[model samples]
Target: GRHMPLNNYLHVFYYSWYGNPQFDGKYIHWNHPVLEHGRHNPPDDIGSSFYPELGSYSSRDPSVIETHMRQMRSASIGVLALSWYPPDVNDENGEPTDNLVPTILDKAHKYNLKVTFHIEPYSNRDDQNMYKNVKYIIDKYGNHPAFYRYKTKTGNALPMFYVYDSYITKPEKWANLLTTSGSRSIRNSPYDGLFIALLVEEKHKYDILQSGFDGIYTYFATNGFTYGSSHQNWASLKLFCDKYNLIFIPSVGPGYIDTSIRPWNTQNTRNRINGKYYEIGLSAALQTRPSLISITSFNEWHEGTQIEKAVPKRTSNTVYLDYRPHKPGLYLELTRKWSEKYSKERATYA
Candidate 1:
């Protein structure tokens, strides 16, 4: 074993939003139309610029889950940072999906893959509720063979959790549960894990430290959407993290454009430029020498940031963006290539 640090491994964000009609009443992401213009069907008319090969197969489908795990393994992704919400809770446009975690774990284990959680913001997610949520997660899935754990400098291997939009809650509230001296601290408890907060602005770094979080991760795929997501700021951010003895995870994406859902947000649209954008982002992320390189997504098609397989699709009313001039698996191949290169570079640090 190389004993490489946790940051050396490449992790991809995964969404489990697709569901069958029986399970979710309708196909969730697959049938999503471009809401701004009220266009429906055909590749061009969809909210997403890309279409999946499976055509919106259900996440609960055994075959679909297996295929996804295989694809991730092929891409050399070490972990799936699954987007998750509490039971009976889900994104505004999606149905409850927490029940599918078990199937994901089972399939992930088959490929020797690992799974972590990207905890989505839910209503009233205060310190007390968060504490209970963390406990529930650990108590339920912590023992699963596919659950991912990060090895810290102290030689403690603990579960890793990504807190999305963590700034919604006050730092003082977070400290009450994250800090050792807090009234409901999980520092030494079984629920103790590496809690990574979202860093949206330069000021959030200090806030994250004050909140007693283990580290910070930039979640937005748009390069300049926020100070934390801006690639140009990563070098200085890494320095700041190093000074604070905290992990810095820089998230990179293939491209970005959610205008199909948010029509007025076209200013933030980023073209993939036939993979050049992704490569540039990856290069920028590597420059920071981060502990971990978090990919913006494996299948967040809503933002056109997914690296999942896509084909040039054209229907009577829709057209989809694809890896033209390259094969469907180009991004996966690139991911594998970069992952190997990153691992080699990290080995030198050992």
Candidate 2:
């Protein structure tokens, strides 16, 4: 008999807040207005570093989902932490994506992929509001086959949530929902989950642990942008995680280049450098032997961390960047390579 495949712990941050004039009435994120210069016109061009092979497509399109699933499968990626918003709530640049989970879950199920929630810093997020939103998610899609749950060291499989910019809310606020002693605590209950907080600074680590979070994840891709994102410090961070018996999920990216959206932020740009950059990012993450790995993005084109297929394209006034010399699926292939390596190492641990 064939052996069952080892569980995949690779997670990529996913964004579905996209639209196009063809699929949608008008462009959504693609039509981003440049902030560097004065009021710019339609742009006629998308506001991202590289151009997607699928073009500026809408996230609601079934075809797009099908192709996207296929692409993830190519990378051996296990979980996609979708950028989630509340019901009827949308990000500043896009339409409401709350209703799109059903379709995404359905398609993901077909491709053997899973979906987790990466809670955005939505409108006035508070402990009380988070309690309601978590309930809403569990009540609705919790039973779906593609809804992801992580098997903990405690030998229980439960839902996992990545709280982006979790530092904005205080520790006591989070403790209200995460700690067993709090008023609205869901701990050890059916609604209990692995709450992961986004970490930026080193000092926030103590606060995160105090907040009763199960783990921490770095969201930024830029190497030195923040204490948490700095690659060199990950090993020490992992040691701290071990000391506290907390899971450490390290986030890595192919590269960082958002000149298209913030031309003035060139100092922050980290060139792909012919894929060497992505190679090292994966290498460093692997060195930590993390419980799981989170890629900064699957298609967050704005921050230019996307591993989705991109090709060279040019507009009248712009010549967009690409994976050139390497081809379109370079990033996906690299992820696949590491995904298997990670899986093999994990199997050994088991």
Candidate 3:
């Protein structure tokens, strides 16, 4: 029986957003307004709408690592595919901290955790810079003991890399970067390989494979959604991996809805009730027993797909306000219960 890699993405953006001096320059006095009239609507109450505070959580928070340590220890999850962005993005205040990448590695090492990075927009760079940046990271951290290399069927040691968008200027340039180092004259990597993730047709899978990716992370296909519902498609995905002899990591989500913290949120007025809808998908993922399982997110408040606790102390009178509100102790209990059950059943299989 094959065991799955219980994985979750640790998001540090909240911290990066709040801790930067530019956004929260007046540390003693927080200055952001919550409720405001946007293009689609009138001023809405922003109480918990923004969470604990505008920028209370920082990637630099010692407690953040502690929280993850607790989660990792309890969940028996072996790896964390941390949500990472190119160093170019600015914090809420438009300042750069460069606090995310180093902090993640430090915390992971302390807990004896294996770490991988989810590259959000590798396709957003030029061939020269892409290779330069890719090489920079690999040269610096690829030698780290915890670095992971995902393989293709051909048995090359390409580390698993994810790109949210794949619109690179030159597909071949991106592909060449994967096969070799960043320096001019494309060279095969002695240590790592690349994996491209996108929602595409099976007909295009070979094109990606041919472009130098060892394997593809498939989405948008019939079997791409559920473990039980898409068993056949899931099997096909696995078979493709088998045929290509690549490391296949089937993807699953906590289920979907249209709520988020962005543009759509401007018009969205209702506070969504948690737990009413996620258990089914969670249980379904448990059944597949993948080598790696990606929870849609831990704290993507904007996207409303987070499994993490809410921003904290936001009173919601609209959605079952009288229903059990989120108490930290109560949440701890739930985490303990689910973590235990997850390990006993999901972590250990027949």
Candidate 4:
């Protein structure tokens, strides 16, 4: 039987979109519009339903970065799957944020945390481009003390990458880069690493295996929205992964509600139920006895799936949702509790 390190069992997705008005032009998410065509607003009426306690601070701020890593350490999170874009390039909604990754790595190291790249879906990202991209990342940051590497069952430790929306490209295209038999394959090469593809449809699992991916992950927090995201399908998915020798990383969330940014998306809102929802998710993830559990987000406020601390606040224009009836640190405490329990459960297999 394969056993993962205790520290590698818990991973959380993280983002870095915050900006300062004076230095970076406009505060990124703080001044985000309440609706698609609406005017930009302050923190109280920003696009997210929950407001961060750190407020709309800059991601370039060392103090804020340190605080974020410290909070993750307190929650027993082992890895931060950081969102990344190529240098001088960024998502349409935010400024270039790649320059802050070194700072994030330094701060994470202070807390004994590790960092992995969550490859965002950039424009025209085919296998050739991805080949160059991964090479760039490994060559640039592979030597960093905090760079995350997953130790496989065969005793090989290699950098692990979570490819977001990987199914967008044809599996045949991916096979060219991922499979050892492909013409341009990186397998057994210096750049070869563990590649995890996104699982959306049930059929994507077959596609992923054929494409030579090492694993699959369900990224969306909204259950029942997709075959992979729904909790009931995880055990079956795990069975499939076991047959194919693929890693199955099940992602869970506290809850999901993005109506603040997508008003018409209210139907997808999942209530936290004062922590009950999160507990259910944790329990389901444990039942599969997966090698790893990935949290949907540590601080993705736009989708309201963040496990980071949030405070209660009400302005004249808008009110924010929080871990009310419980303390601000409720989710972090829950994460710690489950992480401990998971460690003990996995230890029995040893």
Which candidate has the top score in lDDT? Answer: 2
* Model 2 agreement with the true structure over 1-350: per-residue lDDT tens digits: 01223236999999988887776788788756545453332334677878899988889999999999888888888889998999755445656788799999999999888999999999889899899999999989899999999998878899999999999999999999999998999897788999999989999999998999999999888899999999999999999999997889999988888877677898778899887888898899888888999998899988998999998987776688899899899998888878878887776653
Provide the RMSD of all predictions against the true structure, rounded to 1 decimal: 2.8, 2.3, 6.7, 3.0
CA deviation > 4 Å runs, candidate 1: 1-8, 31-45, 88-95
Clashes of 4: 0
The residue pairs found clashing in candidate 2 are none
Please report the TM-score between candidate 1 and the true structure.
0.93
Error at 210, model 1, angstroms:
0.7
Which digits, one per residue and each the tens of the lDDT, describe model 1 over residues 1-350?
A: 23222232788999997765765666567655544345474323456778777665678788889999878887888899998888854344775678889999999999888999999898878899888889888999999999999888788999999999999999999999999999999999889999999999898988999999999899888899999999999999999988998888999999998776777998889988988889999999887887789998899988889998888888777677888889888888888878887887766752
- Candidate 2 accuracy as TM-score: 0.95
C-alpha lDDT (0 to 100) for residue 63 of candidate 4: 84
Worst 10 residues of 4 by lDDT: 1-10
Model 1, C-alpha of 154: deviation from truth (Å): 1.7
Candidate 3 error regions (>4 Å): 1-56, 88-93, 145-158, 167-170, 179-187, 200-204, 218-233, 255-279, 282-289, 315-350
Model 4, stretches more than 4 Å misplaced?
Answer: 1-6, 31-40, 88-94
Please write out the lDDT profile of model 3 over residues 34-141, one tens digit for every residue: 335432211122222333322334445667655755555344444566655556543234344434556666666666566665665533455566556566567767
Q: How many residue pairs clash in each candidate?
A: 7, 0, 15, 0
Instruction: For each candidate, give its TM-score against the true structure.
Output: 0.93, 0.95, 0.65, 0.95
Task: Quickly count the clashes in candidate 1.
Answer: 7
For candidate 3, which ten residues in a row score worst on lDDT? 39-48
What local distance difference test score does each model get?
A: 0.85, 0.87, 0.45, 0.85
In candidate 4 the C-alpha lDDT for residue 266 amounts to 75
lDDT of 1: 0.85
